[PDB]
Amino acid sequence: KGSVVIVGRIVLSGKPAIIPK
Amino acid sequence: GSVVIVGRIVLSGKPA
Amino acid sequence: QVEGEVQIVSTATQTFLATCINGVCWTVYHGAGTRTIASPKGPVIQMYTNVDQDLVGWPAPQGSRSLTPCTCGSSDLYLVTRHADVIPVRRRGDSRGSLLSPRPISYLKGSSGGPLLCPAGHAVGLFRAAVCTRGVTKAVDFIPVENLETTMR
Amino acid sequence: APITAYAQQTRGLLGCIITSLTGRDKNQVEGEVQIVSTATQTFLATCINGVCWTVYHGAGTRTIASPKGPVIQMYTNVDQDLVGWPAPQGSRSLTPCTCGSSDLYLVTRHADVIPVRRRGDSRGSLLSPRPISYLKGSSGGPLLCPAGHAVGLFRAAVCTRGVTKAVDFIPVENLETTMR
Ligand SMILES: *C(=O)C1([C@@H]2[C@@H](NC(=O)C3CC3)CCN2C(=O)[C@@H](NC(=O)NC2CCCC2)C(C)C)CCC1
Ligand SMILES: [Zn+2]
Ligand SMILES: [Zn+2]
Numbered sequence: 242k243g244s245v246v247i248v249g250r251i252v253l254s255g256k257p258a259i260i261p262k
Numbered sequence: 263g264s265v266v267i268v269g270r271i272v273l274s275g276k277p278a
Numbered sequence: 279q280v281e282g283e284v285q286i287v288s289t290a291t292q293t294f295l296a297t298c299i300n301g302v303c304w305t306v307y308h309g310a311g312t313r314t315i316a317s318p319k320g321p322v323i324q325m326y327t328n329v330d331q332d333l334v335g336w337p338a339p340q341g342s343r344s345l346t347p348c349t350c351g352s353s354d355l356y357l358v359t360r361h362a363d364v365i366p367v368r369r370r371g372d373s374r375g376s377l378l379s380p381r382p383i384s385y386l387k388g389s390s391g392g393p394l395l396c397p398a399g400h401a402v403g404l405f406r407a408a409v410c411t412r413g414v415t416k417a418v419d420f421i422p423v424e425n426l427e428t429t430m431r
Numbered sequence: 432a433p434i435t436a437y438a439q440q441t442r443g444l445l446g447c448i449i450t451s452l453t454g455r456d457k458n459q460v461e462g463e464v465q466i467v468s469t470a471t472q473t474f475l476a477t478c479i480n481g482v483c484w485t486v487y488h489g490a491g492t493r494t495i496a497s498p499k500g501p502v503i504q505m506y507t508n509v510d511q512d513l514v515g516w517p518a519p520q521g522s523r524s525l526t527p528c529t530c531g532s533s534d535l536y537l538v539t540r541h542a543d544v545i546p547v548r549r550r551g552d553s554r555g556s557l558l559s560p561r562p563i564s565y566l567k568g569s570s571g572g573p574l575l576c577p578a579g580h581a582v583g584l585f586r587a588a589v590c591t592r593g594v595t596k597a598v599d600f601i602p603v604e605n606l607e608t609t610m611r
Contacts, residue, residue, distance in 0.1 A: 242493060242495065243334075243451035243452060243454075243469060243470050244449045244450070244451050244452075244454040244493060244494045244495060244496040244497045244501045245439065245451075245467045245468070245469055245476075245485075245490050245493045245494070245495045245496070246266065246442065246447050246451050246456060246467060246468050246469075246495075247277075247441065247442070247458070247465045247466065247467055247476075247494060247495075247496070247519070248267065248437060248440065248441060248442045248457060248466050248467065248473070248475045248485070249440040249441050249442070249448050249465075249466035250438070250439055250440050250441065250460070250461055250462035250464065250465055250466060250522075251436050251437070251441055251462055251463070251464040251465075251466065251475070251538060251542045252274070252276075252436060252437050252438075252439070252461060252462040252463070252542075252574075253434065253436050253462070253463045253513070253525075253538065253575075253579065254462075254463065255274050255275025255276060255277075255435070255436075255437060256275045256432070256435075257271055257272070257273045257274075257275060257276045257284075257358050257362040257364060257435070258269055258271065258272055258362050258366065259269055259270070259286075259361075259362050260270040260271065260272055260280055260282050261549075262269075262579075263289060263290050263313060263314060263316045264313055264314050264316040264321050265287050265288070265289055265290075265296075265305070265309075265310050265313050265314070265316065265353050266316045267285045267286070267287055267314075267315070267339060267343050268286045268287060268288050268293070269285075269286035270281075270282025270284065270285055270286065270341060270342070271282050271283070271284035271285075271286065271358065271360075271362055272280055272281070272283070272318065272437075273283050273284065273345075273356065273358065273393075273395070273399060273435050274399075274435040274436055274437040274542070275321075275435070275437070276280050276422075276437035276439075277280070278280060313611050344446045346543075349546055349558050349559045350534060350546035350558055352534060352576060352577065356433045364433070366432065395433045396433065397433050397434060397534070397536065397547055397577040398433065398434055398536050398544045398545070399433040399434055399435040399544055400544070400546075
């Protein structure tokens with residue numbers, strides 16, 4: 242039987258930012 | 263004249 | 279690829295904010311007027327002009343994504359400024375809320391059009407104007423998100 | 432301040448499968464909620480108190496792939512439908528809620544935050560009901576109070592004609608309980 246695998250993440254602690262250019 | 267867009271803000275902080 | 283829900287905008291004189299809600303890029307009439315918004319295909323005309331409510335909207339531009347309207351009726355709001363600072367605002371009535379922690383006038387300068395978010399980060403309103411007492415802002419006026427919702431029919 | 436979230440995908444189907452089998456995951460980890468997959472299924476695993484938790488009905492007794500090979504559960508409580516591995520190196524942990532608020536916020540696998548009104552110890556209702564397909568893959572996701580603290584883990588949905596109005600969740604206290 243296979244292992245559970247992380248395939249992605251959700252990040253809650255990021256805060257509003259200006260998108261860098 | 264037009265309204266120009268000068269920058270953007272991502273509310274989640276999501277990086278490039 | 280990263281999309282923004284808030285746009286930092288300019289006219290020849292002023293500079294302020296726009297917020298995308300439901301596929302429309304909304305901002306304040308007192309900043310935009312009836313102006314068109316720029317696009318790489320040439321100017322784009324406003325979809326909505328509501329002089330009464332201080333409200334204007336164009337189709338959401340590229341590099342944008344939309345905020346969801348708040349539906350939790352909460353009163354703990356958060357204002358986002360053009361510097362990406364977040365300041366808590368307690369909701370007073372329909373269109374007004376008070377800072378939990380008052381700030382010099384310039385700290386909010388150029389942020390009108392920006393969003394007022396609930397705890398879920400859903401849109402409660404657009405920051406309309408700073409309510410000032412001698413260089414110090416202790417409250418804010420805003421366009422309730424329902425005005426935007428109704429303007430759409 | 433306000434809860435906002437984003438998702439990033441770190442592996443595709445082929446890489447996931449290989450990793451499920453090798454049980455060796457070398458990728459770096461960030462964030463509070465991990466998107467996890469098995470052969471048949473995808474769900475969420477929330478990190479609370481240094482431990483990464485998810486539902487038993489998805490993970491079973493399965494190990495989690497890590498930079499050092501498979502990692503065995505630290506807690507397994509079938510009745511509670513709860514399972515937990517030590518939180519991966521580099522994840523960040525949620526704080527259990529202590530304000531007893533009734534205004535809840537579910538964080539979905541698409542990184543949306545949706546309002547939920549508490550209506551009991553382990554049930555809440557969606558203020559804006561949603562299609563069941565939208566919540567697919569979201570089991571194990573956290574329910575936060577207005578301060579962003581973990582109130583519980585999304586366990587199941589009450590749907591009627593494919594539209595979901597309420598959600599059942601495992602409350603944080605049951606986690607702490609499981610921890611003893
Ligand atoms: C959790 O995602 C989900 C689950 C889903 N299980 C999974 O996605 C992975 C964990 C393995 C199965 C569909 N589903 C449900 O909750 C169904 N409900 C259910 O089994 N419910 C009982 C408890 C209360 C009423 C009956 C439901 C039919 C969607 C949560 C939403 C997706
Ligand atoms: Zn809300
Ligand atoms: Zn709390």
